Design a protein around this nucleic acid. Structure first.
Ligand SMILES: Nc1ccn([C@H]2C[C@H](O)[C@@H](COP(=O)(O)OP(=O)(O)[C@H](Cl)P(=O)(O)O)O2)c(=O)n1
Ligand SMILES: Nc1ccn([C@H]2C[C@H](O)[C@@H](COP(=O)(O)O)O2)c(=O)n1
Ligand SMILES: [Cl-]
Ligand SMILES: [Mg+2]
Ligand SMILES: [Mg+2]
Ligand code: NA
Ligand code: NA
Ligand code: NA
Length: 326
DNA sequence: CCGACGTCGCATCAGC
DNA sequence: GCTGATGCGA
DNA sequence: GTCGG
């Protein structure tokens, strides 16, 4: 794209601040700046031009000037050369290893892929599966594969109970030609904001997907959120498909629109929209939009009958899913 | 200047 | 066991 | 790191 060099630089800085510095707000600031520059429809000529965008300030403007003049950023060149930062950044690429566990592993001399495989007994379950599928989980999913996966999930869910509705969200719902994983929103009329009239609603679906060998591993699992591993079936003599991350979120059926707004994302779009809600005097989660009293405490849920109702409350024009890929 | 920055599910741990 | 952080993830 | 009161 037009400003790929700048946005990659800001993303690398974002990852440093999260993984090494453990500075969650600097991480989000860099990602917000990279996102707003990514959708800017001109090739940026100067830091000053970029600083006009919301989320770009004086410091990123200076870095943009350095990068435009030299093609690189000295601050990043040094980070790339630091072994502890290098080790930490690698270890956090394993699902289940975060900034804290990464730094503890390096303290103990566990810093490479051979180190990890040599010490499986020092990994919790999630980390163990992330290491197992380390290569697969960095591969992207062609939309064609997402379509075959959607068909399995939708048909298997239908076999459990035809009253389930499963909706693939994430980047797939935003129309992306490839996705990092599969996100499935799930509803069933027995689970509403007012009652749960049937247990094991999420479990039953997971069990059925395991029994047809679509779901292969479990990272975490509770009553409303499954986080796991899935894999398409391959034909005779075919090489196997890579294993894929899958997330399944069971949402109260009457709160579907807030739930599908949340799970469609992107993450940055949700942050921006929820931040706008707060400025407008509302708070949004995956269940409800509520007003804020002068108090500061959230009031009662407002009526929502479409995704667009949520946008209307905060005085945003509606944005189709394909336009939320911030 | 400086407080706020989105919001929450599940796993793990510490204190009682 | 419970409860309230903290980690890591969506 | 950036924003807004
Ligand atoms: N920090 C986050 C992460 C995710 N989310 C929401 C929004 C996101 O679209 C949805 C699924 O999480 P993913 O990490 O899979 O994001 P996607 O938008 O699907 C990525 Cl573009 P992907 O295609 O690489 O998976 O969960 C969020 O609200 N906050
Ligand atoms: N997973 C889903 C998807 C849609 N729905 C409901 C919400 C609306 O009444 C309707 C939306 O239909 P559609 O968005 O496919 O046009 O179906 C649901 O209850 N659970
Ligand atoms: Cl709520
Ligand atoms: Mg996804
Ligand atoms: Mg603010
Ligand atoms: Na700006
Ligand atoms: Na990780
Ligand atoms: Na996901």
């Amino acid at each position: 794209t037009l400003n790929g060099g700048i946005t990659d630089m800001l993303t690398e800085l974002a990852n440093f601040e999260k993984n090494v510095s453990q500075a969650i707000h600097k991480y989000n600031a860099y990602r917000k700046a990279a996102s707003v520059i990514a959708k800017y429809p001109h090739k940026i000529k100067s830091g000053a031009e970029a600083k006009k965008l919301p989320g770009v300030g004086t410091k990123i403007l200076e870095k943009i000037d350095e990068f435009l003049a030299t093609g690189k950023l000295r601050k990043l060149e040094k980070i790339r050369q630091d072994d502890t930062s290098s080790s930490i950044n690698f270890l956090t690429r394993v699902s289940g290893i975060g900034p804290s566990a990464a730094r503890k592993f390096v303290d103990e001399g566990i810093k490479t892929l051979e180190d990890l495989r040599k010490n499986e007994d020092k990994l919790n379950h999630h980390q163990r599966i992330g290491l197992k599928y380390f290569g697969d989980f960095e591969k992207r999913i062609p939309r064609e594969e997402m379509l075959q996966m959607q068909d399995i999930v939708l048909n298997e869910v239908k076999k459990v109970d035809s009253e389930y509705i499963a909706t693939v969200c994430g980047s797939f719902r935003r129309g992306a030609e490839s996705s990092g994983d599969m996100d499935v929103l799930l509803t069933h009329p027995s689970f509403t904001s007012e009652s749960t009239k049937q247990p094991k609603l999420l479990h039953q679906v997971v069990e059925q997907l395991q029994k047809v060998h679509f779901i292969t591993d479990t990272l975490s699992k509770g009553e409303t959120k499954f986080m796991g591993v899935c894999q398409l079936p391959s034909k005779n003599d075919e090489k196997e498909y890579p294993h894929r991350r899958i997330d399944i979120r069971l949402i109260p059926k009457d709160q579907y629109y807030c739930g599908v707004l949340y799970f469609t994302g992107s993450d940055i779009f949700n942050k921006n929209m929820r931040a706008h809600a707060l400025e407008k005097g509302f708070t949004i989660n995956e269940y409800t939009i509520r007003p804020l009293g002068v108090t500061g405490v959230a009031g009662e849920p407002l009526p929502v009958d479409s995704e667009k109702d949520i946008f209307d409350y905060i005085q945003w024009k509606y944005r189709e899913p394909k336009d939320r890929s911030e």
